[PDB]
Write a protein that holds these residues in place. Structure first.
Motif, PDB file in Angstrom:
ATOM      1  N   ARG A   1       2.477 -18.213 -40.379  1.00 14.70           N
ATOM      2  CA  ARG A   1       2.976 -16.886 -40.706  1.00 14.70           C
ATOM      3  C   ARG A   1       2.183 -16.267 -41.833  1.00 14.70           C
ATOM      4  O   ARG A   1       2.104 -16.835 -42.921  1.00 14.70           O
ATOM      5  CB  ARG A   1       4.465 -16.950 -41.091  1.00 14.70           C
TER       6      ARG A   1
ATOM      7  N   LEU B   1       1.870 -13.485 -44.557  1.00 21.55           N
ATOM      8  CA  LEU B   1       2.689 -12.590 -45.351  1.00 21.55           C
ATOM      9  C   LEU B   1       1.811 -11.545 -46.037  1.00 21.55           C
ATOM     10  O   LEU B   1       0.832 -11.888 -46.719  1.00 21.55           O
ATOM     11  CB  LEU B   1       3.445 -13.383 -46.422  1.00 21.55           C
TER      12      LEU B   1
ATOM     13  N   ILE C   1      11.421  -9.852 -45.408  1.00 18.11           N
ATOM     14  CA  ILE C   1      11.572 -11.155 -44.780  1.00 18.11           C
ATOM     15  C   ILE C   1      12.987 -11.682 -44.934  1.00 18.11           C
ATOM     16  O   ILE C   1      13.595 -11.536 -45.991  1.00 18.11           O
ATOM     17  CB  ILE C   1      10.566 -12.167 -45.407  1.00 18.11           C
TER      18      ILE C   1
ATOM     19  N   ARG D   1       6.523 -24.713 -41.223  1.00 18.09           N
ATOM     20  CA  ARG D   1       5.806 -23.450 -41.098  1.00 18.09           C
ATOM     21  C   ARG D   1       4.894 -23.195 -42.272  1.00 18.09           C
ATOM     22  O   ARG D   1       5.340 -23.205 -43.425  1.00 18.09           O
ATOM     23  CB  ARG D   1       6.791 -22.282 -40.967  1.00 18.09           C
TER      24      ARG D   1
ATOM     25  N   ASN E   1       2.765 -20.729 -44.490  1.00 20.56           N
ATOM     26  CA  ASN E   1       2.721 -19.304 -44.816  1.00 20.56           C
ATOM     27  C   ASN E   1       1.429 -19.036 -45.576  1.00 20.56           C
ATOM     28  O   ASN E   1       1.076 -19.793 -46.481  1.00 20.56           O
ATOM     29  CB  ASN E   1       3.903 -18.918 -45.704  1.00 20.56           C
TER      30      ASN E   1
ATOM     31  N   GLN F   1      -0.418 -16.043 -47.709  1.00 23.65           N
ATOM     32  CA  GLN F   1      -0.238 -14.742 -48.339  1.00 23.65           C
ATOM     33  C   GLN F   1      -1.613 -14.134 -48.566  1.00 23.65           C
ATOM     34  O   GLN F   1      -2.481 -14.781 -49.138  1.00 23.65           O
ATOM     35  CB  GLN F   1       0.476 -14.916 -49.683  1.00 23.65           C
TER      36      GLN F   1
ATOM     37  N   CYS G   1       4.465 -23.981 -47.651  1.00 23.19           N
ATOM     38  CA  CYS G   1       5.219 -24.276 -46.437  1.00 23.19           C
ATOM     39  C   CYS G   1       6.662 -23.830 -46.593  1.00 23.19           C
ATOM     40  O   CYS G   1       7.303 -24.129 -47.600  1.00 23.19           O
ATOM     41  CB  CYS G   1       5.108 -25.777 -46.113  1.00 23.19           C
TER      42      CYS G   1
ATOM     43  N   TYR H   1       3.667 -11.420 -53.954  1.00 24.13           N
ATOM     44  CA  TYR H   1       3.278 -12.698 -54.534  1.00 24.13           C
ATOM     45  C   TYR H   1       3.074 -12.585 -56.040  1.00 24.13           C
ATOM     46  O   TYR H   1       2.202 -11.857 -56.511  1.00 24.13           O
ATOM     47  CB  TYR H   1       2.005 -13.224 -53.867  1.00 24.13           C
TER      48      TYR H   1
END
Lengths: 68, 68
Positions: A35, A37, A43, A51, A53, A55, A67, B47
């Motif tokens: 995924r 981001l 979200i 999963r 992630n 960024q 994760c 982030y």
């Protein structure tokens, strides 16, 4: 697998910071699912240790990974 | 403050997984700001390397932690 996910995120955070997220770097990551981001993304938090992630910033550059 | 954020996350991942999120563990985390993530929480992703996140399950148990 939460283990390979954590290895993956560690590799990304330590080695690809600042590089554009390309199909190449996406293909190199073996665990699922992935995924991406982006800033602003709304979200609904559901924790999933398998999963990965990634960024990226508004210029599609990798700024982090974890994760969940 | 990303240095102290990361040391805290490392600490909760090492010593506190599976334990309830109490005022004791909160007093124990000097970092500002602290974000406790819960199942179902809706978030706008941004982030922030200096923000400590504590992932808790439906039983208010600590399952993980990461800076973002």
């Amino acid at each position: 697998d939460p283990a390979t996910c954590e290895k993956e995120a560690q590799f990304v955070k330590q080695e690809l910071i600042g590089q554009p997220y390309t199909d190449a770097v996406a293909n190199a990551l073996q665990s699922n699912p992935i995924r991406v981001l982006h800033p602003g993304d709304m979200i609904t938090m559901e924790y999933i240790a398998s999963r990965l992630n990634i960024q990226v910033n508004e210029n599609n550059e990798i700024i982090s990974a974890h994760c969940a």
